[PDB]
Amino acid sequence: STMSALSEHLRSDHRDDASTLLATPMINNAIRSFLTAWDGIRILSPDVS
Amino acid sequence: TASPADTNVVPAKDAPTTNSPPSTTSPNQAAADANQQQAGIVSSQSGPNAVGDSAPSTSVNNDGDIITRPTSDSIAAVANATKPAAVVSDPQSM
């Protein structure tokens, strides 16, 4: 809804080379999410714990 | 929806012999029966298929012997049965 919110989304989910030079254990799975175009619903990959 | 429990099914640890009851009489047949009963199948529905089958059991050694304790203990038992005293006391010793 606001340009600020979108900016943070990019600043969090879509910056890739950021925070590179440090030990990083939080490796996730390959697929994070999918979006279905015909309805606009987003599906998140299940996390096995 | 995408339940992992229905997608990541793999054999559990110690699968081939987990259900084997502790016995010495006919371990393979007994283990086979335990698997059959564990799986929810009842004998009245399996029919003739239940009579001759046999399955691996923990009571059977890899060499093909009836064992009642872990094989290491069997090795330990025979080893402990032969331990001569290191230092003995006899009058003629120099």
Query: Which residues of chain A are within 8 Å of residue B3 when distances are taken between CB atoms?
Result: 46
Resolution in A: 3.3
Alpha-carbon distance A22 to nearest alpha carbon in chain B (angstroms): 32
Residues of B in contact with A32 (CB under 8 A): none
Q: How far is A42 from A9, CA to CA, in rounded Å?
A: 15
* Closest to B28 (Cα-Cα) out of B52, B11, B63: B52
The helix/strand/coil state of B78 is: helix
User: Secondary structure of B33-76 in the HEC alphabet?
Assistant: HHHHHHCCCCHHHHHHHHCCCCCCCCCECCCCCECCCCHHHHHH
- A48 touches B: beta carbon within 8 Å: yes
DSSP A45: P
